[PDB]
UniProtKB/Swiss-Prot annotation, chain B:
Oligomeric form and interacting partners: Homotetramer and heterotetramer with GRIK5. Tetramers may be formed by the dimerization of dimers. Assembles into a kainate-gated homomeric channel that does not bind AMPA. Can form functional heteromeric receptors with GRIK4 and GRIK5. Can form functional heteromeric receptors with GRIK3. Interacts with DLG4. Interacts with NETO2. Interacts (via C-terminus) with KLHL17 (via kelch repeats); the interaction targets GRIK2 for degradation via ubiquitin-proteasome pathway.
Note: The postsynaptic actions of Glu are mediated by a variety of receptors that are named according to their selective agonists. This receptor binds domoate > kainate > quisqualate > glutamate. It does not bind AMPA without coexpression with GRIK5.
Similarity-based family: Belongs to the glutamate-gated ion channel (TC 1.A.10.1) family. GRIK2 subfamily.
Species in which this protein is naturally found: Rattus norvegicus (Rat)
Known role: Ionotropic glutamate receptor that functions as a cation-permeable ligand-gated ion channel, gated by L-glutamate and the glutamatergic agonist kainic acid. L-glutamate acts as an excitatory neurotransmitter at many synapses in the central nervous system. Binding of the excitatory neurotransmitter L-glutamate induces a conformation change, leading to the opening of the cation channel, and thereby converts the chemical signal to an electrical impulse. The receptor then desensitizes rapidly and enters a transient inactive state, characterized by the presence of bound agonist. Independent of its ionotropic glutamate receptor activity, acts as a thermoreceptor conferring sensitivity to cold temperatures. Functions in dorsal root ganglion neurons.
PTM field: Sumoylation mediates kainate receptor-mediated endocytosis and regulates synaptic transmission. Sumoylation is enhanced by PIAS3 and desumoylated by SENP1.
Subcellular location: Cell membrane; Postsynaptic cell membrane
Tissue note: Highest expression is found in the olfactory lobe, piriform cortex, dentate gyrus, hippocampus, granular cell layer of the cerebellum, and in caudate-putamen.
Covered residues, full protein: 81 to 226 of 908
Protein name (Swiss-Prot/TrEMBL): Glutamate receptor ionotropic, kainate 2
């Protein structure tokens, strides 16, 4: 017996197809009340917008726009620039802001009313470092994408602080085949342990090079910063014998997960795919899984709080919203168990710094879960118990 | 206009608010969480903008109405790299406090892939006092080019 | 050293690629002359002789 609206900001270039997460977002809207259990007497609606690449001023508008009505809580943009203002704004007006990307929060900022389902790297980069520290490498190359890659990995760069991993860092140029100058050195420096950092969009790009650069052998052992490792196309590679390694958080070990994905894959590709890119079009990418779970994680908090009503909140004013402080800290206890496994924000900072990474690797058959990681227990490698008394 | 450090929304107002009078070249906030916000406006409103600090430079923000008299870190980072290799040093230790110090110094961090060096990297924690252990380690570690 | 009409060469080569045998190590020699007719590009960087 109730309707409720969220906000929404997304990106595009002047038109559709809509932001594939937005397209996949409105889904998590609908799927709520078809698991009717979920917020039964409180039907959820929403509002969205679409904003610029490399901008927040427009996103400031669409922020203030979605604040004209006011919205119960905003799910936010892609760029940091776009999502840092949306952070402050909501957090200068009580509104909860939500995040699914990573972006380096300046550690001199006062803010509260934002959270980021994105699993932070101070764990990821710890996990990398564990994994590395297991394969007993005494060397590694860290290929990243752009400057901010560093700040993403600084746990790793600081492994020589304690550990004999004399590593080197190499940055990809603009294009994919802008790799060849780089890789050529690697093969000439003979750097047979490679950790990347780039959205998989460069992975397939960088990989087809590592193939055409004759670096797909048993020798090289590529490790990927990202999770969407699975989204790529195994097949061209799985025979060469290469060792490859990456993590996984879209916990496909659950039928429901493997159904919802499928139920989403039942609907996802109503847009035409892209063949050459090397992605398994039909595998719901992580970046969307969060924008999905968020909806649940977020709206489950609403399933604690009766008094909430969206309100017209103008940027002309200063007036913070009513129940933000009452509603915001509801979030930081939302221990939702969805696609990305356990979900529980580090209440100190409000970041998802606890989760289960299941390390996948490349056996000739495909991508095999071979070990499970968490912040707490380190690495359970299925290989660990390959001999018993 | 005087405002609080690290609040964009707050910082966003004065940008347009000044423009309610119109200004020629705003001289922006010196801390990127705000600086870009202003920058997000200046070329978005045709207005040129003048900046002093380095800021969390982004790859391809399509503004062009912003400059700064400040020397780009690349030149700086290259400049140290001139200096160190000049001093023939090998086992350097870079020491910062904030993550952005990396981007401040990547032109240097990348170099060992080209110039035979070694460089640990260490970070000053939240409090200033917290360096006493750092120095202690940097004492434990015998680092004589910092 | 192979022996097959190039029709198998491209076939056998795309394998030698997907079988991780396109390195500086292996040195493939072809019985046939139509070696040129194949498509160099996928290979010329791997360093193979």
């Amino acid at each position: 017996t109730h309707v409720l609206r969220f906000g929404g900001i997304f990106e595009y270039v002047e038109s559709g197809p809509m932001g594939a997460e937005e397209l996949a977002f409105r889904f998590a809207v609908n799927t709520i009340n078809r698991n009717r259990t979920l917020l039964p007497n409180t039907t959820l609606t929403y509002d969205t917008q679409k904003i610029n690449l490399y901008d927040s001023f427009e996103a400031s508008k669409k922020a203030c726009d979605q604040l004209s009505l006011g919205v119960a809580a905003i799910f936010g943009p892609s760029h940091s620039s776009s999502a840092n203002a949306v952070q402050s704004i909501c957090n200068a007006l009580g509104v909860p802001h939500i995040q699914t990307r990573w972006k380096h929060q300046v550690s001199d900022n006062k803010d509260s009313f934002y959270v980021s389902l994105y699993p932070d790297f101070s764990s990821l980069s710890r996990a990398i470092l564990d994994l590395v520290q297991f394969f007993k490498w005494k060397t590694v190359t860290v290929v990243y994408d752009d400057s901010t890659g560093l700040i993403r990995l600084q746990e790793l760069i600081k492994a020589p602080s304690r550990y004999n991993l004399r590593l080197k860092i190499r940055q990809l140029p603009a294009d994919t085949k802008d790799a060849k100058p780089l890789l050529k050195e690697m093969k000439r420096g003979k750097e047979f342990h490679v950790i990347f950092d780039c959205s998989h969009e460069m992975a397939a790009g960088i990989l087809k090079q590592a193939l055409a650069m004759g670096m797909m052998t048993e020798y090289y052992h590529y490790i990927f910063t990202t999770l969407d490792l699975f989204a790529l196309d195994v097949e061209p590679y799985r025979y060469s014998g290469v060792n490859m390694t990456g993590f996984r958080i879209l916990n496909t070990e659950n039928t429901q997960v493997s159904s919802i994905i499928e139920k989403w894959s039942m609907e996802r590709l109503q847009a035409p795919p892209k063949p050459d890119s090397g992605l398994l079009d039909g595998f719901m990418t992580t970046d969307a899984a969060l924008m999905y779970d968020a909806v649940h994680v977020v709206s489950v908090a609403v399933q604690q709080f009766p008094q909430m009503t969206v309100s017209s909140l103008q940027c002309n004013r200063h007036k913070p919203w009513r129940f933000g402080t009452r509603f915001m800290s509801l979030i930081k206890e939302a221990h939702w168990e969805g696609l990305t496994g356990r979900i529980t924000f580090n209440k100190t900072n409000g970041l998802r710094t606890d989760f289960d990474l299941d390390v996948i690797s490349l056996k000739e058959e495909g991508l095999e879960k071979i070990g499970t990681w968490d912040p707490a227990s380190g690495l359970n490698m299925t290989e660990s118990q390959k001999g018993k008394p």
